Write a protein that binds this ligand. Structure first.
Ligand SMILES: NC1=N[C@H]2[C@H](COC(=O)NS(=O)(=O)O)N=C(N)N3C[C@@H](OS(=O)(=O)O)C(O)(O)[C@]23N1
Length: 821
């Protein structure tokens, strides 16, 4: 196994070559491939000449476009503010679940708010070991008949870990970090031998401008600093006296044309302050307008002559996006100011001097100047993290992650070098961790910074707030949507994707505006930040909420999952279904499987619904399991048993009701199946005048109820299907869809020209054909999960937690960003 690292300079290739010698990662060999600039390396990676490089967030965006097709895979974790610990968050969630779902696991936290390494489930007496995230170490479960397991201690905090490491087995003459009672870093740190002191934030990163030799006054250190985003700054010497608003005509040093801190951040502010006569691409290129602003500059990678005049690279190296240009990058631009080739340098806080005292200070955009350690209040914006990138195909992602994880374990010299600063990686880097597997540049940079860097390259025509771009998941849907657009007078347009999750992505990225989602995609949509705009109202018995919008809705008409038993079976209650014989409509059904499997899992320590029951029928399971024993294949015997077809006599709503009456004690079905198959409503012989007053439903409190009281004695009601959009577009989509409904709904004034809720092109296109109308979602002041799902369903299926991961998109779309206001 090989990893080929692309380097951009002779200096960086030197450091990479040293790593090949010094860093011994078994199973994976590093090699180094030289190219002359950042862009030549991007192309080398695209072409397979190399596998990975580290990119500034501005280059991350550039590499993500079709020219190069690279994606970020590894970056340093950062933090925006202090958060609740995980254990305390989990406690709060589960205590907010549905109290009628009895016997749920409530985590046990310790005096620092972490998980006790032994976790227990009160109602079952089972204990197990957990990791720091509170996730069960599988195979450590012990039963109440046994003593609690012996679980290893939790991993130490960063500060306590690095303290114990530094001590080895007192470490004389070396820094030993000082930790607070919570095990985080004390704000002030001192070197126990040199006498120097400085400030750190809560995770131990140094605050620049605070390093203090002994005998001097130290700057005040802020406590509880969890904002570890990097900030773009403008740095100047204290011997000059201009302010930010007087930058016109000065000499400037920039980290580089493609860097977010050297280009995007300052240009963004130059434009917001109208220091720059530029606003759109009709006014020329931004680089040209900047060329008219400064007199001479060093901006590596530029083409305008004055914007390279101040660089000092020899011959073809001059003004190259490469360390062979001595003024390239953050520490290059600072050097350019130091040697007085510029009056101001544009870089980021992590490249500022460590020492408090000296000739440098910060130029604030509000036309004041402030000390180096005040960058959080004197900056040109937070900027995104930087990242290691590879091909979008990801053929080398695992080898790159393995190598860097193991090199970091062995403490290889990744993050400094005698040959120079910021070679291969930023010298300020401390750890590189893998990014979510579905991350791309949009989700890594965040919509705000992504749009901001797009905005400097093209005129981004924002689509109209009076048009809803509907996202379709198959060709018949697209055709029905084009017919809607033709009568809509421009209010409706169409986009095409392959599945609902890709529609969610398009809505997030501003390529579409709305889509109808089945219940099973809503957790993912709500977790990514979309909101229900309107919902499908399916109650055929009441059209009043559809006639007069805004009206009160007595019953929304959604199905309610119930547990169905015969009145003859007086001994069975909810609390004793273990080992009984159960009938499921099929594996994957929500009212007959997901809702029951969720409740069994929450009350029995995730013990399989397979093992929970005795002999059952659940079409879709493997034919050899105890979930197919009750399954009667086909009356016309063929290889049709436990099958996902009407071949299986026990498949579906009515089929599970068969399995109950024939050979079973309980069936999980919607509340409608019994009424559709009793009172002689089904002609078949087995339901021969079978009486609705011959069955009951099981309540979760151990009681029972006649099947007519499904409203207050159900496993869980389902939520309606929902039309979701971005938070800011809810009001638009509601207004447009309600107007369309008055024209083309079931009582539409123009229903002869188009019908929203049916079609000849197929079934349930865009909306479900049984929809009565779309009802605006009345947002309540509670968690959106509880608001949309209802507490019962949220608890039953997701444990009332925001931490389930039904889709691998969720970790990408919830990734946190470094954006401004
Ligand atoms: N904000 C809000 N509006 C409701 C409508 C449906 O309204 C009924 O279901 N009507 S009703 O007559 O049957 O109550 N949409 C939802 N997805 N919800 C979930 C339900 O959760 S519930 O609280 O478990 O019903 C709800 O809260 O109603 C509701 N939450």
């Amino acid at each position: 196994r090989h990893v080929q690292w692309c380097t951009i300079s002779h200096l960086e290739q030197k450091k990479c070559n040293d790593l090949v010698g010094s860093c011994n990662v078994p199973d994976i060999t590093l090699a180094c491939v030289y190219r002359s600039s950042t862009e030549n390396c991007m192309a080398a990676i695209k072409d397979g000449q190399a596998d990975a490089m580290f990119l500034d967030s501005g280059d991350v965006y550039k590499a993500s476009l079709d020219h190069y097709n690279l994606k970020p895979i590894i970056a340093e974790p950062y933090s925006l503010h202090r958060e609740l610990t995980k254990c305390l968050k989990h406690r709060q969630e589960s205590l907010g679940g549905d109290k009628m779902v009895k016997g749920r696991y409530i985590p046990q936290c310790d005096e620092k708010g972490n998980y006790h390494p032994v976790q227990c489930h009160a109602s079952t007496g089972y204990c197990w070991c957990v990791n720091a995230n509170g996730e069960k170490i599988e195979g450590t479960n012990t039963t109440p008949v046994q003593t609690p397991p012996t679980c290893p201690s939790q991993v130490l905090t960063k500060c306590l870990k690095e303290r114990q490491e530094a001590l080895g087995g007192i470490a004389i003459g070396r820094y030993i970090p000082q930790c607070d009672e919570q095990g985080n870093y004390r704000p002030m740190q001192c070197h126990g031998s040199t006498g120097y002191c400085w400030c750190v934030n809560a995770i131990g990163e140094k605050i620049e401008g605070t390093n203090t030799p002994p005998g001097n006054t130290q700057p005040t250190c802020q406590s509880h600093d969890w904002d570890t985003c990097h900030y773009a700054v403008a740095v100047v010497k204290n011997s000059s006296t201009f302010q930010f608003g007087q930058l016109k005509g000065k000499r400037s040093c920039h980290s580089g044309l493609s860097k977010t801190d050297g280009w995007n951040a300052p240009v963004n502010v130059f434009v917001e302050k109208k220091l720059l006569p530029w606003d759109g691409l009709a006014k020329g290129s931004i680089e040209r307008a900047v060329s008219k602003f400064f007199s001479a500059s060093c901006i590596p990678g530029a083409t305008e002559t004055n914007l390279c005049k101040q660089c000092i690279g020899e011959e073809e190296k001059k003004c190259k996006s490469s360390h062979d240009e001595p003024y390239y990058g953050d520490h290059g631009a600072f050097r350019c100011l130091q040697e007085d080739k510029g009056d101001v340098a544009f870089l980021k806080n992590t490249a500022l001097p460590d020492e408090h005292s000296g000739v440098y200070e910060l130029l604030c955009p509000d036309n004041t100047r402030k000390p180096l350690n005040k960058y959080k209040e004197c900056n040109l914006g937070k900027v995104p993290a930087d990242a290691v990138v590879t091909r979008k195909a990801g053929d080398k992602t695992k080898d790159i992650n393995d190598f860097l994880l193991e090199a970091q374990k062995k403490k290889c010299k990744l993050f400094g070098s005698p040959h120079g600063k910021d070679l291969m990686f930023d010298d300020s880097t401390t750890h590189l961790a893998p990014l979510p597997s579905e991350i791309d540049a949009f989700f890594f940079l965040g919509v705000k910074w992504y749009n901001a860097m797009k905005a400097l390259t093209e005129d981004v025509k924002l689509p109209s707030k009076n048009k809803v771009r509907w996202c379709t998941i198959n060709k018949p849907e697209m055709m029905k949507c084009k017919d809607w657009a033709a009568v809509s007078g421009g209010a409706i347009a169409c986009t095409e994707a392959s599945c609902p999750e890709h529609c969610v992505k398009q809505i997030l990225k501003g390529e579409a505006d709305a889509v109808t989602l089945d219940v099973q995609y809503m957790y993912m949509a709500l977790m990514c930040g979309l909101l229900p705009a309107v919902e499908e109202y399916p109650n055929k018995d009441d059209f009043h909420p559809c006639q007069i919008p805004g009206s009160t809705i007595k019953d929304f008409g959604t199905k309610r999952a119930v547990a169905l038993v015969k009145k003859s079976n007086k001994d069975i209650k909810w609390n004793n279904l273990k080992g009984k014989k159960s009938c499921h409509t099929h594996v994957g059904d929500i009212p007959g499987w997901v809702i029951p499997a969720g409740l069994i899992s929450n009350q029995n320590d995730n013990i399989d619904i397979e093992s929970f029951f005795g002999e059952s029928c659940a079409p879709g399971s493997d034919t050899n399991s105890k979930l197919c024993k009750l399954c009667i294949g086909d009356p016309e015997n063929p290889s049709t048993r436990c099958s996902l077809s009407d071949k299986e006599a026990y498949y579906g709503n009515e089929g599970a009701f068969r399995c109950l009456v024939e050979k079973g004690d309980v069936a999980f079905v919607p509340h409608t199946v019994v009424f559709a198959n009793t009172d002689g409503k089904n002609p078949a012989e087995w339901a021969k005048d079978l009486k609705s007053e011959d069955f009951e439903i099981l309540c979760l409190d151990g009681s029972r109820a006649p099947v007519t009281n499904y409203r207050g004695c159900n496993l869980s009601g389902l939520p309606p299907r929902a039309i979701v959009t971005r938070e800011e577009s809810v009001s638009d989509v509601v207004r447009i869809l309600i107007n369309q409904q008055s024209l083309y709904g079931r009582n539409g004034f123009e229903k002869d020209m188009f019908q929203m809720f049916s079609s000849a092109k197929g079934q349930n296109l865009l909306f479900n054909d049984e929809t009565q109308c779309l009802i605006e979602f009345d947002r309540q002041p509670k968690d959106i999960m509880e608001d949309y799902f209802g507490v019962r369903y949220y608890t039953a299926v997701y444990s009332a937690s925001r931490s389930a991961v039904p889709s691998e998109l969720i970790p990408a779309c919830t990734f946190k960003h470094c954006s401004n206001s």
